[PDB]
Design a binder for this molecule. Structure first.
Ligand SMILES: Nc1nc2c(ncn2[C@H]2C[C@H](O)[C@@H](COP(=O)(O)OP(=O)(O)OP(=O)(O)O)O2)c(=O)[nH]1
Ligand SMILES: Nc1nc2c(ncn2[C@H]2C[C@H](O)[C@@H](COP(=O)(O)OP(=O)(O)OP(=O)(O)O)O2)c(=O)[nH]1
Ligand SMILES: [Mg+2]
Ligand SMILES: [Mg+2]
Ligand SMILES: [Mg+2]
Ligand SMILES: [Mg+2]
Ligand SMILES: [Mg+2]
Ligand SMILES: [Mg+2]
Lengths: 431, 431
């Protein structure tokens, strides 16, 4: 039921907010814009670590583009939905801008829990507990708590950052429940690991300490259970599909364009792989009148994004009933007519950009930096009577369980930028 | 008896030197001035490590100021003492300048055994043997020798530096016995640890290898025993109180002034905490005519130092008999009327200067530097057949017991400046 999916509740509320008596979905955008976690995204790795103030993307600019594309997708889908179910507007009072606001707010914050150095950073944080110092804690934690530690993802960290309670400020940013539902793409815990081939089962979305919180949200939105066991799991919110589609479109095209502009990909491929996407709307005279690679690739990027957005809207509207029922098992991008072109673009990006020498060098350095910082924090946690551990506490982190302390350490390491992490690493070693 | 406390003996002497047949107490000043250990004090930490050639103090300038204040205190106390005991001048032949010379010489060398990076350096050297590599030696040493290693202080190292025998030069600097007595403030060994609440029992003053030497000195000056056990301990030399008073006055006031000049303390506090000390002699017109913070704080510092010096002289002359008997249990500064102001100044200095971010960064770096250098020296000591250990010996240290070798390693690390230690650390790691 769509009347329960578009909820306006906030954490710690007793009177039900109504749409007629209102806007809630724009304050979420404003609150995310003005927060420190969002501001820390300006110097976090998207693909190339330590961007050197070049023209390449960071996490912040990527999130902004995903937000624009998400607003467009949400507006179109909301128009079609309001056409399909008239009573959503004539009784409850929902307009087609609310869907755009929800998807834009969710897409702006979709990537906020990521640590420095990107995917390699998450792998390093996991390997620290798996085959490093943190291994010593294995006997002192529940299997669900250990699987949280050794398979750390930014998806759970983002939910925690968004919904963190502190003395005097309950609920953290206190976003609406619809935004939280559209933000979550893996509504399950860390065990069991990969129970099936469903798209919503690749990873997990919340930690144990936050688990209870999500239950509340999942009760309010009327999500559909899938547990059939002692481990909880729910079905996806329908707008989470749109969030994922926007994320995928943006990074797939922009990575290719950035690699072309950097000199790692020849310009010819730009027309070898993209023409079928842009052939139906390209103006040949305008394309031929341009005189630099940047203009041509920008033109192609704009046309491709438009085409993919339209196709994604059509695909979503086709399989709406299955998504509402919970039986859909793929993403909207896998039901597309240009899957071969996307696959070729991704494979070329993997061969040329992800495995380039400079990228590998930066990832190797990031492994060492993260391991050193985590080991210092953990050793200061174990013994708190020495002078050195007091100094470490004063520099890095100015009544809890062991699991809560370890989660706090992981969270505090992941709020740093690449530059701050490198500077602290050099300071620890006195260089 | 004061005739035995003002002794002119030197190490390796058989004919008793007499005051009538003389000056001995000034050659000590000259010999300390011209020695390499005194010259190494120019680049050693007082409060802020790696001073960056700023206006802040180092160990050398601090020692010079302590020497000036000590000369003043000694001159005043010697005048009053010669007034009290006439026979000290009419028979033996002691003038009021001898006390000033003794206190000045002792105060100039009071701080010569300190390692690089200050207090954090001593803590690092101790922690290396406590919870580091050096722990392996615990089973091979006597409990008194291990407590020397794990509670390393600069007070014992200074005595060793002053009285070190080498082939062709016995006695080291060969200072007079009165100067050595006034230099020592903790005449006891490293065990037992803190037997009481006496001021002279907080730490220890000599190592085991030097123990016999001090006994000789303690026999010549007629110090009073306090052992009542198998572990030796004596009472303090009376002029050691004056040395300690001068040290305390100087660092307490100058730390505050330096923090004000650096921008870490607001100027208002300068008059909130100091007025009662300077209110009885301050000229208001001169204070108001000045136009910079530096001039005002310098004026206040001068007035405060004068007031505290006078009060300390009065306090010493009040409790003279108890100090001579050995029953005095506090310092001269705790019997003062401005204890609350001193306590407030010290607490503000701890909150603002000792715990500032830059200071913590430098201390954290110093821990790593000292640990690396000590581990290299110890590993070269254990195995001496490898090529690498021969290289280490040639770079760092171009028939003894294990304890003597470990003490020598600790001494050789503590003669380095901060810059030399950092340069050697970088060279070891090839950066
Ligand atoms: N350097 C580097 N970048 C990578 C690698 N794998 C993926 N990336 C980049 C490509 C994209 O810019 C970005 C994709 O991360 P996102 O968090 O936006 O989504 P992703 O689909 O990777 O995962 P998620 O939805 O969070 O489970 O990461 C890799 O192995 N190395
Ligand atoms: N950075 C830093 N400086 C400190 C700390 N504690 C004391 N200091 C500084 C303040 C003074 O400038 C200086 C005092 O050392 P001294 O060797 O002159 O005498 P202290 O009374 O500390 O000890 P002592 O008579 O040697 O047992 O050390 C600390 O925790 N951090
Ligand atoms: Mg992500
Ligand atoms: Mg994804
Ligand atoms: Mg993204
Ligand atoms: Mg000292
Ligand atoms: Mg002291
Ligand atoms: Mg001193």
């Amino acid at each position: 039921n769509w009347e329960h999916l578009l909820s306006l509740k906030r954490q710690g509320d007793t009177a039900k907010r109504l749409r007629i008596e209102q806007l809630g979905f724009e304050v979420d955008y404003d609150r995310i814009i003005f927060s420190a976690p969002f501001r820390s995204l300006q110097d976090k790795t998207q693909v190339i670590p330590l961007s050197k103030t070049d023209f390449v993307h960071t996490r912040l600019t990527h999130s902004l583009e995903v937000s624009v594309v998400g607003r467009s997708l949400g507006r179109m889908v909301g128009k079609k939905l309001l056409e399909k179910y008239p009573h959503l507007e004539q009784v409850y009072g929902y307009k087609f801008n609310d869907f755009g606001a929800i998807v834009a707010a969710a897409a702006l914050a979709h990537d906020i829990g990521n640590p420095p150095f990107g995917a390699s950073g998450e792998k390093a944080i996991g390997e620290f507990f798996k085959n490093g110092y943190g291994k010593r804690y294995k006997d002192s934690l529940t299997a669900k708590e250990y699987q949280d530690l050794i398979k750390f993802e930014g998806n759970a960290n983002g939910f925690k950052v968004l919904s963190q309670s502190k003395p005097g400020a309950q609920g953290g940013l206190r976003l609406s429940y619809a935004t939280l539902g559209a933000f979550m793409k893996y509504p399950k815990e860390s065990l069991p690991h990969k129970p099936s081939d469903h798209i919503a089962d690749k990873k997990y979305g919340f930690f144990q300490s936050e688990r209870a919180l999500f239950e509340d949200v999942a009760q309010e939105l009327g999500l559909l259970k899938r547990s059939t066991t002692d481990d909880v799991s729910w079905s996806r919110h329908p707008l989470a599909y749109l969030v994922e589609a926007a994320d995928d479109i943006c990074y797939t095209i922009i990575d290719f364009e950035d690699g072309i502009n950097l000199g790692l990909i020849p310009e010819e491929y730009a027309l070898e792989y993209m023409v079928k996407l842009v052939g139906q709307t390209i103006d040949r005279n305008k394309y031929n009148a341009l005189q630099e690679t940047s203009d041509r690739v920008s033109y192609l990027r704009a046309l491709a994004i438009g085409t993919l957005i339209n196709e994604s809207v059509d695909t979503f509207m086709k399989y709406e009933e299955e998504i509402l029922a919970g039986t859909f098992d793929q993403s909207l991008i896998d039901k597309s007519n240009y899957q071969a072109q996307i696959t070729d673009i991704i494979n070329l990006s993997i061969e040329r950009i992800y495995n380039s020498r400079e990228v590998i060098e930066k990832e190797i350095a990031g492994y060492e930096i993260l391991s050193t910082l985590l080991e210092a924090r953990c050793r200061a946690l174990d013994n708190n009577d020495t002078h050195y551990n007091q100094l470490i506490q004063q520099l890095l982190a100015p009544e809890k369980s062991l699991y809560e302390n370890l989660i706090q350490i992981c969270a505090e390491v992941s709020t740093m930028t690449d530059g701050k992490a490198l500077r602290n690493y050099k300071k620890i070693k006195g260089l």
